[PDB]
Every structure is written in structure tokens, then in C-alpha cells.
């Protein structure tokens, strides 16, 4: 009876007599109607989750060094005939050749191949991607964090060697860094829309992978029931 | 909010006059009302193995209707 | 101007200039030079991210300048022991400085001299964003072990 | 006064196809089988130690209907039925919970948060905004530089007079409009399907015009200041503007309606139908 | 063999005692040495500070602190350590290309 | 340090600096142990020195937004004969792949990760009301039982 009352009305029950017990049971029922409410309520909080971007390391992680454990989707791609390839072609030559079946054209034909599921990831120059990340509105396409870039170089000014102008332009650029101006130009020119945080997306339909847990417990109870049927059936000597 | 009631009356009438084919003339509305809101009281519920299925369809409808109400109402409580 | 770093905007006949955070820039373009046709004409008016760095530097260190585009060989790519484009133009003394998109590496630190880097850059990866899912064990979250 | 934006106040209307939406179309089948699975498995563990009754009990614990009267008499079958009831509770709890979670986050749109909204900084053909040609607003945008692209976009659509821009917003031929606040606010009050986005822009003040060095200047600019302490302009204000006939607050969360709950009524009708068939089969089996 | 002065925190008699150090910079330093044939010694700053200008003597005389001051005073020769890059230090010192952004 | 150099000669941060002067510490080794004791509420430093913390320990975490940009460097007295060779040998170590090796050997452990801090399941200390009421129900029963026997 009480089990049924806690979860919900299951079956007829020869429930009480004993006008006192007819009150203990009602206290339990009240407790149940509050307990189920608390459960249904708080569970409605665990069903609002945030977007999820994978925590992948740099080019050095397993997902490219040993790109055959999860064979299907490993699709490190690139753009042909350029400075991008040579650095790859000189440190990961095998992992260079593997990419041979993934040469795109331009950069848009590659950014598109990440919204139509043709490709896994994409390798290119940082500061152009970042500005290109702030372009598209479909923020489902955003690069990994910095501090993982491979060959950290910069952008520089070319001076005829041995000139005396060099020292002064250096001090001037460090000046522009010093008083926050650089952020002003950077923000006006490069940083666009998609400096946003991951949304609270309502789930899609619950699916069997999500709700498998209840079914495994259902089956385990089936097995335990079988086991008790067996144990009781041991009673053929009494 | 009233399509519910009209379906209620219709199903009750057809339920009893399907039960006629193989004590249960107005006790229906009692039963179905109880089933929509929640279990209230003993009921001389059916016979007539067909009606034992119409009623179950109604019960399913109820368990979905109460869920929709409780759910959407939880939106009107954030101001 | 192979970048969104510096941009050229064709000359305006509505006024004759741009003057709105912009600057003029030449292009002594030679083309179809089979009849010794003398080259040169004012191509588009210039503006962009590196251009503003340029202006502020010029006003802070007090010089003036003369902006003009390249002709061939967008960036420096050595051919037969010679440099073509934005690095030749510095090694042949036909210029003094070169600004814009121009990285840093040993292969260039012998011909020309380099400033302090003002951006980070390098090789990095793009990925897509995975939607939010539910643990296979959600239905046990909302109650601590005791209760 | 200053400048503001005038957008169309969307009417909230909840998006929902049918009651199946919180469940992947497979899960329905999975439970529709597992019910019978446990039914059969229960039918055995009482004989080897009532079939229709067991099937009723099984397929009726989940439906919360009281129909069905039998009960497992074994030990094993009792231990099963208990957790069967539990799992049935979990199913409905999760369904209504996830439905609640979806119905909260289903909110219509986001009003423009002013001029700093990036939705305006980038031009798109799916978002058009304009003003009146040859006015002070285009004077403000032209000689501004950070709004170069903004202006470059507007030039293609600007209208002739606000009397046209308003009738063009209320027809969804446009998506925004920029003008003098004190001329828009009179709109959000007279009509109440339009509403503004609050943030006050470039600041100004209306004035009177006289040719330079006219004998009338000083007396006029004095008589104005008199009309701001005796209380005259307040009277003109109240007589002509500030009606507040319509007010907005906390656009509702869009109650459900007859056009999306249509699934369950379809299923109960279909239940009515199938009954008129499966009735006779009884008479036959008799 | 890190030759450290800071046997104890500042505010107590210092008894400069040998220690040993390692990590990012020491490895980079060893690479440089193999490349350019040095023989190095290392001793930790006696200040425990990075270094900046400050008035002294209740006067306007501007002096530095810590390791930067230990360089400008010739007390050191090279700062192989996590030192940032700014304008205000660039007017007395020579900064290599950056090795970590 | 360099952070106070950045804040002092900035003007929009006049009040900020005016606040900080009263608490600044001696070395990050103290500021970290002072944050993990709730004697402080924030700390500002070089990213690449903080990120190693959010990974080794995992009760601290940073707030993402990247600030004033710089780059570490080596120091030599002005006009030293060693300058050019050093600043070359660096650039070699960024294409052969040496600095990547040093990186991986010393930083980038990612031992702890954070994602979507949970919505804080209930516990034994707030549901205590209902269990109190069911206990109290047990009690009252042992009283109202005898009253039945009396009324019999
Ligand atoms: N910056 C390099 C040249 C250089 C430039 C670009 C590039 C081109 C267009 C745009 Cl809009 C943005 C960028 Cl960053 C890309 C790469 C890389 P890759 O060409 O192999 O694809 C490159 O090397 C230099 O200093 O020579
Ligand atoms: C995530 O959900 C959105 C919802 O519109 C959908 O467009 C997108 O394709 C989904 N992405 C994945 C990887 O399932």
C-alpha cells in the first residue's frame, strides 16, 4: 500500500481498519503528495543545459596523432598551396599526407563544410579565423581558445636594415599598447558579434541514450525477480 | 476549457450506449470527472470489455492534459 | 591590401577625396607593357586597421610618408635567390618600410629588419558547437543520497 | 528630446506542434513494447509457483487509471510490480518536467537594445531600417564615421515623411525607424501595437527659426523662458501629448490554444472510432 | 645549482644558500647555451620583486627595484625569467623577440 | 610589477588604483593562498600563470575575457653583442617545434575541467520538515490510540 501511495495509485488494496491507522496512512499520503511535487519540480531545473564545445588541446592531442581510434570522423582539413601546409609538412608529414583527401578551395568553401557535416575541424591562420569567427551569425561555429596556437608569431613592420628609425617605432608601438588605444582599434575593426556566451538551449526530445538508465534498472529488477523465483523454488524438500 | 466538457458529455453518452450491447447511466460523468482531475472516490466503473478500453483512452488523455496544465502554469509564475 | 587589415576604396568623385579616417595611396600600375606605355595612376583611396597604426605612429614620431601599392608578388616569396614584392621593394631600396599583413620568421630576418609584433598569430583550429544534452543518469540528480 | 527606435510589438504565440514533442518518436515505441514485455513476464511467475488480468494491471498502472483488479500473488511478481510502478512514475515525471523546461525558454524574440546593438552594426537584407530623407538624422549619420556602414545601408530605403514610415512599419514592410523621441512617444500611446526601445540617443531640443540678426530675437527668447515657470508649457503638454491610453508591461507567456492541443482530441476521436469496430468482435467471440 | 639568497622570507637575516631550480625557462636557457656556447650561473633576486621606478630620499631621484635594477646596475647580465614587455622598461633595456604571448 | 604600471598611468582607472593601493600583496604565491581562504575576492595577473592554476587545482576558475596584451621576453643591457643571435635562436624554436614540446612538458595538463555548474540537488538538511512531520504523526498516534479503547 505505502509503496503505491508514494509513487502513484496502482491497485486495489485491503487498506486499513482501525480508525487510528486511517490517520497514519493519511499523514503518509500527504507526505507523498509533497514528495512527488518536490521531485517533479527540481527535475525541471536539470533539463535546461548550456551549449558544449569540446575541450580539445592543440595539434598534439590524440585526435590527430592517433587518428584511428575513433576512425570515422577524423577530418583535419586545410587549404592547398600555401604557408599553412609547409609547417605541417615538416613536423607531421604522415599527418600531412592523410589530409590529402580534404583540400578545400578558398576559405568560404571550408567554413561551409563545417555547417554541412563534411569535415571535423580546420587548420589555418589564427588572426584571420578569429575575425572570421565574428562574421557568421550561426555561432555554432567558433574556434578553440588561444594559448593553443602552434607556431606563435606575430605581425611586424619591415625596416631597411641598420636604420636608426627602428628604435623609435618600437617605443611608439609599445606606447600604443601602454595606453589602451590598441584595444580601441582592435574592437572597432576585428572583434565583431560573436563574443557571446553559450546559450541555455532547451533540449530536443529525450532519446534512448538519455533515458537508458531507467531501462537498465528495469532489467536488473527483472533479473532479481527471476533470482527470487529460483530461490523460492528451492523449497522442494519442505 | 470547454471542448473538454463537450468531449466529456459525448464520450459518456456513447460509453453507456456501447455498454448496452454486451447501473451505469449517469455514474459515468462522476467517473470521468474524477479521472480528469484526480482519483476521488470508488466508482462502479465498467463492465463491457469494450468500455474497459474507451475509459482507458480517456485516462490517457487526462494524464496528458493535467501535465500540460501544470507545465504551462509554471511559466505564468515568473514575473 | 590582400586583407581586411587594410582596404582600398575606389576614389570618390562626389568630393574628390575620402578624408574620413582615410588616406591616399598610389598604384604605379604597369600593364600590357608591350609598347613601352608609361605606367601609373591614382588607384583607390586607402583605409584599414594597419593604416590607423601607421597614422598614429607618424604623428607620434614626426615624419611623413608616401603610400603606394605593390605590383607583383603579393608577399615575399624568394625565387632563384631573389625577393619579389613587398620584401624586394625593401631590399631594392625602392622603399623604406612596409606595413600591412607581413609575418615574422628567420627567412626574412636577414634581408629586412623587423619591428615589435603588434598582433598574435599562428596556426589554430576551428570547430563547431555541440548542442546541450542530458546525462544518461539525470533522473537521480534531484535528491541527495540520504533522502 | 532625443532619438529612439520604433518597432512592431509582436503578439506572443507559443510554438508547439503536438503532445509528442517531448519524446523522440522511438521512445513511444520502446515503452509501447516494454509494457507488454513486463505483462507477459508477469503472467508466468504466478503460474509456475489470470492472463487478461495481468495484462490489464500492467497496461493500467502506467495510465494511472484504476481499471484492473488483479494483483501478483507471488513473492517475485510483487518485487517486480513494485519497481514497475516506480518506473511508470519516472516516465510521467520526466515528460512533464522536460515539457516545462521547453515551455519556459520558448520566448518570442529580443527587442533592439538601442544603437549599440550589433544587430544594427552589421547590414543584412533580413533587417531593414530607414529614416526620412534630407533631415537632421541623416545629417547626424553622414558626418559620423563609425556609422559609415550604417549610412551606406540606409541610403537605399529612406522614406518621404514619418506619416509613411509609420504606415510602413505597421505593415511589416519595415522593421525599424528612427526619429525624434517626442514624436514617437505620441505613437506608442495613441496606437498600442507599436512600442519603442527606450534608450535615449543623440540629445537636442526643438527651437524657433529667425534670420540672423533680427530685431525679434531677444523678446522671443525671453517670452519662452516665462512659459516655463508660470506653467504654460505644462498646460500645452497635457492638452496635446501625454494620453497614456495604452500601456505595456511584461508581454504574456502566450497561453496555449486550440490549434496545438489538436493532437489529443484527434486521438480521443480515433479512440471513439476503433470502439465501434472492436465492439462487434466481442459479439462474434461470444 | 640555483644560488639563492632567500633562505628565508624578507624581513629576517638572509643566509644565501645553494638551491636548485628548474622548469620552462631553465630548459629554454639550456637550449640557448647549447646554441651559442655560454657558461652560465644563476642567482635569484634579493628583492623578490619584478621592478619599477620609484622616488627616493624624499626626493625626485628615480631608481628601480629588484631584477630590473639588478640588470641596469650591471649586477646581472641577462634576465632569463618571466618578464613582460612594456614601453616604460624599453627605454633602458633590450628585449628579445617574445617567446610566449 | 607591470600591472600597477598599467593601472597608474591609466586615468579611467584612477579610482580603481586608488582602491587597490591598500591591499596589494608580495607575490602570487601569497595571493593564491589568500583567495583560497576567502580573504580576497579576485586577483589579476598574467594569464599564462593563472591558467596553470585552474588546471592543477580545480576549485578556482577564471573569467575568460582577455585583457591588456603583451608577450614575455628576455632582458639584456642595451647594445650587447648577444642580441641578434638570441633573438634569432628564438624564432628557430617556433617552427622546428621546440617551444611546443616545452609547452606540453610543463603546462597544459587539463587535469580538472569545468562545465555547467550543476543546479544544486536538494539534500538532507532542507527536506527535514517533512520527516519531522511524519515523526510527529507517529507520536500523536500513540496518544490517540488509547482514546479509542476508552470510547469503546
Ligand atoms: N601573413 C603571411 C601571409 C599569409 C597571409 C594569409 C592571409 C591571406 C588573406 C587574408 Cl584575408 C588573411 C591572411 Cl592571414 C594567410 C597565410 C597563410 P596561408 O597562406 O598559408 O593560407 C599567410 O601565410 C605573411 O606574412 O606573408
Ligand atoms: C543543434 O540544435 C539546432 C536547433 O535548431 C540545430 O539547428 C542544429 O543542427 C543542432 N546541432 C547538432 C549538432 O545537432
PDB file of N, CA and C in Angstrom, chain F residues 84-129:
ATOM      1  N   UNK F  84      71.415  39.867 -31.355  1.00  0.00           N
ATOM      2  CA  UNK F  84      70.853  39.366 -32.599  1.00  0.00           C
ATOM      3  C   UNK F  84      70.804  37.846 -32.624  1.00  0.00           C
ATOM      4  N   UNK F  85      71.856  37.190 -32.144  1.00  0.00           N
ATOM      5  CA  UNK F  85      71.874  35.736 -32.176  1.00  0.00           C
ATOM      6  C   UNK F  85      70.769  35.158 -31.310  1.00  0.00           C
ATOM      7  N   UNK F  86      70.554  35.739 -30.133  1.00  0.00           N
ATOM      8  CA  UNK F  86      69.488  35.269 -29.262  1.00  0.00           C
ATOM      9  C   UNK F  86      68.141  35.443 -29.938  1.00  0.00           C
ATOM     10  N   UNK F  87      67.843  36.663 -30.370  1.00  0.00           N
ATOM     11  CA  UNK F  87      66.552  36.881 -30.994  1.00  0.00           C
ATOM     12  C   UNK F  87      66.385  36.106 -32.285  1.00  0.00           C
ATOM     13  N   UNK F  88      67.453  35.544 -32.839  1.00  0.00           N
ATOM     14  CA  UNK F  88      67.258  34.609 -33.938  1.00  0.00           C
ATOM     15  C   UNK F  88      66.929  33.221 -33.418  1.00  0.00           C
ATOM     16  N   UNK F  89      67.765  32.696 -32.525  1.00  0.00           N
ATOM     17  CA  UNK F  89      67.548  31.360 -31.995  1.00  0.00           C
ATOM     18  C   UNK F  89      66.148  31.183 -31.447  1.00  0.00           C
ATOM     19  N   UNK F  90      65.526  32.249 -30.948  1.00  0.00           N
ATOM     20  CA  UNK F  90      64.121  32.133 -30.580  1.00  0.00           C
ATOM     21  C   UNK F  90      63.291  31.719 -31.781  1.00  0.00           C
ATOM     22  N   UNK F  91      63.343  32.500 -32.857  1.00  0.00           N
ATOM     23  CA  UNK F  91      62.468  32.239 -33.993  1.00  0.00           C
ATOM     24  C   UNK F  91      62.662  30.843 -34.559  1.00  0.00           C
ATOM     25  N   UNK F  92      63.864  30.279 -34.448  1.00  0.00           N
ATOM     26  CA  UNK F  92      64.043  28.893 -34.859  1.00  0.00           C
ATOM     27  C   UNK F  92      63.173  27.970 -34.035  1.00  0.00           C
ATOM     28  N   UNK F  93      63.057  28.244 -32.753  1.00  0.00           N
ATOM     29  CA  UNK F  93      62.326  27.383 -31.852  1.00  0.00           C
ATOM     30  C   UNK F  93      60.833  27.553 -31.964  1.00  0.00           C
ATOM     31  N   UNK F  94      60.346  28.217 -32.997  1.00  0.00           N
ATOM     32  CA  UNK F  94      58.918  28.319 -33.212  1.00  0.00           C
ATOM     33  C   UNK F  94      58.483  27.716 -34.530  1.00  0.00           C
ATOM     34  N   UNK F  95      59.381  27.066 -35.256  1.00  0.00           N
ATOM     35  CA  UNK F  95      58.951  26.350 -36.446  1.00  0.00           C
ATOM     36  C   UNK F  95      59.490  24.931 -36.449  1.00  0.00           C
ATOM     37  N   UNK F  96      60.662  24.709 -35.863  1.00  0.00           N
ATOM     38  CA  UNK F  96      61.075  23.328 -35.683  1.00  0.00           C
ATOM     39  C   UNK F  96      60.136  22.607 -34.731  1.00  0.00           C
ATOM     40  N   UNK F  97      59.520  23.340 -33.809  1.00  0.00           N
ATOM     41  CA  UNK F  97      58.522  22.776 -32.924  1.00  0.00           C
ATOM     42  C   UNK F  97      59.013  22.578 -31.509  1.00  0.00           C
ATOM     43  N   UNK F  98      60.046  23.316 -31.130  1.00  0.00           N
ATOM     44  CA  UNK F  98      60.654  23.113 -29.825  1.00  0.00           C
ATOM     45  C   UNK F  98      59.788  23.667 -28.705  1.00  0.00           C
ATOM     46  N   UNK F  99      59.327  24.905 -28.854  1.00  0.00           N
ATOM     47  CA  UNK F  99      58.525  25.511 -27.802  1.00  0.00           C
ATOM     48  C   UNK F  99      57.249  24.730 -27.552  1.00  0.00           C
ATOM     49  N   UNK F 100      56.690  24.101 -28.582  1.00  0.00           N
ATOM     50  CA  UNK F 100      55.541  23.235 -28.359  1.00  0.00           C
ATOM     51  C   UNK F 100      55.895  22.101 -27.416  1.00  0.00           C
ATOM     52  N   UNK F 101      57.078  21.525 -27.590  1.00  0.00           N
ATOM     53  CA  UNK F 101      57.493  20.445 -26.713  1.00  0.00           C
ATOM     54  C   UNK F 101      57.634  20.935 -25.284  1.00  0.00           C
ATOM     55  N   UNK F 102      58.250  22.105 -25.099  1.00  0.00           N
ATOM     56  CA  UNK F 102      58.385  22.652 -23.750  1.00  0.00           C
ATOM     57  C   UNK F 102      57.025  22.927 -23.127  1.00  0.00           C
ATOM     58  N   UNK F 103      56.155  23.586 -23.883  1.00  0.00           N
ATOM     59  CA  UNK F 103      54.766  23.769 -23.500  1.00  0.00           C
ATOM     60  C   UNK F 103      54.176  22.486 -22.946  1.00  0.00           C
ATOM     61  N   UNK F 104      54.086  21.463 -23.789  1.00  0.00           N
ATOM     62  CA  UNK F 104      53.407  20.243 -23.383  1.00  0.00           C
ATOM     63  C   UNK F 104      54.080  19.600 -22.192  1.00  0.00           C
ATOM     64  N   UNK F 105      55.397  19.694 -22.102  1.00  0.00           N
ATOM     65  CA  UNK F 105      56.058  19.072 -20.974  1.00  0.00           C
ATOM     66  C   UNK F 105      55.684  19.759 -19.672  1.00  0.00           C
ATOM     67  N   UNK F 106      55.488  21.077 -19.693  1.00  0.00           N
ATOM     68  CA  UNK F 106      55.368  21.811 -18.435  1.00  0.00           C
ATOM     69  C   UNK F 106      53.999  22.404 -18.161  1.00  0.00           C
ATOM     70  N   UNK F 107      53.297  22.898 -19.167  1.00  0.00           N
ATOM     71  CA  UNK F 107      51.973  23.459 -18.945  1.00  0.00           C
ATOM     72  C   UNK F 107      50.973  22.566 -19.653  1.00  0.00           C
ATOM     73  N   UNK F 108      49.695  22.937 -19.618  1.00  0.00           N
ATOM     74  CA  UNK F 108      48.659  22.228 -20.369  1.00  0.00           C
ATOM     75  C   UNK F 108      48.502  20.780 -19.893  1.00  0.00           C
ATOM     76  N   UNK F 109      47.996  20.648 -18.666  1.00  0.00           N
ATOM     77  CA  UNK F 109      47.648  19.351 -18.100  1.00  0.00           C
ATOM     78  C   UNK F 109      46.154  19.069 -18.149  1.00  0.00           C
ATOM     79  N   UNK F 110      45.326  20.107 -18.021  1.00  0.00           N
ATOM     80  CA  UNK F 110      43.865  19.995 -18.111  1.00  0.00           C
ATOM     81  C   UNK F 110      43.321  18.907 -17.192  1.00  0.00           C
ATOM     82  N   UNK F 111      43.980  18.713 -16.048  1.00  0.00           N
ATOM     83  CA  UNK F 111      43.607  17.632 -15.140  1.00  0.00           C
ATOM     84  C   UNK F 111      42.177  17.790 -14.635  1.00  0.00           C
ATOM     85  N   UNK F 112      41.741  19.022 -14.395  1.00  0.00           N
ATOM     86  CA  UNK F 112      40.371  19.309 -13.995  1.00  0.00           C
ATOM     87  C   UNK F 112      39.723  20.195 -15.047  1.00  0.00           C
ATOM     88  N   UNK F 113      38.456  19.931 -15.342  1.00  0.00           N
ATOM     89  CA  UNK F 113      37.684  20.734 -16.275  1.00  0.00           C
ATOM     90  C   UNK F 113      36.365  21.134 -15.635  1.00  0.00           C
ATOM     91  N   UNK F 114      35.836  22.271 -16.066  1.00  0.00           N
ATOM     92  CA  UNK F 114      34.565  22.771 -15.575  1.00  0.00           C
ATOM     93  C   UNK F 114      33.589  22.899 -16.731  1.00  0.00           C
ATOM     94  N   UNK F 115      32.316  22.653 -16.440  1.00  0.00           N
ATOM     95  CA  UNK F 115      31.257  22.815 -17.429  1.00  0.00           C
ATOM     96  C   UNK F 115      29.928  22.834 -16.690  1.00  0.00           C
ATOM     97  N   UNK F 116      29.167  23.914 -16.864  1.00  0.00           N
ATOM     98  CA  UNK F 116      27.761  23.980 -16.471  1.00  0.00           C
ATOM     99  C   UNK F 116      27.566  23.515 -15.025  1.00  0.00           C
ATOM    100  N   UNK F 117      28.114  24.314 -14.109  1.00  0.00           N
ATOM    101  CA  UNK F 117      27.944  24.070 -12.682  1.00  0.00           C
ATOM    102  C   UNK F 117      26.514  23.644 -12.373  1.00  0.00           C
ATOM    103  N   UNK F 118      26.384  22.529 -11.660  1.00  0.00           N
ATOM    104  CA  UNK F 118      25.108  21.849 -11.526  1.00  0.00           C
ATOM    105  C   UNK F 118      24.077  22.727 -10.818  1.00  0.00           C
ATOM    106  N   UNK F 119      22.793  22.429 -10.998  1.00  0.00           N
ATOM    107  CA  UNK F 119      21.748  23.217 -10.339  1.00  0.00           C
ATOM    108  C   UNK F 119      21.501  22.840  -8.890  1.00  0.00           C
ATOM    109  N   UNK F 120      22.468  22.185  -8.247  1.00  0.00           N
ATOM    110  CA  UNK F 120      22.495  22.045  -6.789  1.00  0.00           C
ATOM    111  C   UNK F 120      21.320  21.215  -6.267  1.00  0.00           C
ATOM    112  N   UNK F 121      21.416  19.910  -6.511  1.00  0.00           N
ATOM    113  CA  UNK F 121      20.460  18.953  -5.968  1.00  0.00           C
ATOM    114  C   UNK F 121      20.155  19.232  -4.502  1.00  0.00           C
ATOM    115  N   UNK F 122      18.930  18.900  -4.101  1.00  0.00           N
ATOM    116  CA  UNK F 122      18.498  19.060  -2.724  1.00  0.00           C
ATOM    117  C   UNK F 122      19.298  18.131  -1.831  1.00  0.00           C
ATOM    118  N   UNK F 123      19.019  18.181  -0.540  1.00  0.00           N
ATOM    119  CA  UNK F 123      19.841  17.425   0.380  1.00  0.00           C
ATOM    120  C   UNK F 123      19.059  17.167   1.655  1.00  0.00           C
ATOM    121  N   UNK F 124      19.762  16.667   2.661  1.00  0.00           N
ATOM    122  CA  UNK F 124      19.112  16.092   3.820  1.00  0.00           C
ATOM    123  C   UNK F 124      18.695  17.172   4.804  1.00  0.00           C
ATOM    124  N   UNK F 125      19.222  18.381   4.628  1.00  0.00           N
ATOM    125  CA  UNK F 125      19.149  19.443   5.619  1.00  0.00           C
ATOM    126  C   UNK F 125      18.036  20.436   5.346  1.00  0.00           C
ATOM    127  N   UNK F 126      17.333  20.306   4.234  1.00  0.00           N
ATOM    128  CA  UNK F 126      16.207  21.175   3.948  1.00  0.00           C
ATOM    129  C   UNK F 126      14.906  20.428   3.760  1.00  0.00           C
ATOM    130  N   UNK F 127      14.942  19.163   3.367  1.00  0.00           N
ATOM    131  CA  UNK F 127      13.768  18.311   3.412  1.00  0.00           C
ATOM    132  C   UNK F 127      13.442  17.860   4.827  1.00  0.00           C
ATOM    133  N   UNK F 128      14.156  18.373   5.825  1.00  0.00           N
ATOM    134  CA  UNK F 128      13.975  17.935   7.199  1.00  0.00           C
ATOM    135  C   UNK F 128      12.586  18.216   7.738  1.00  0.00           C
ATOM    136  N   UNK F 129      11.815  19.076   7.081  1.00  0.00           N
ATOM    137  CA  UNK F 129      10.484  19.369   7.576  1.00  0.00           C
ATOM    138  C   UNK F 129       9.549  18.182   7.471  1.00  0.00           C
TER     139      UNK F 129
END
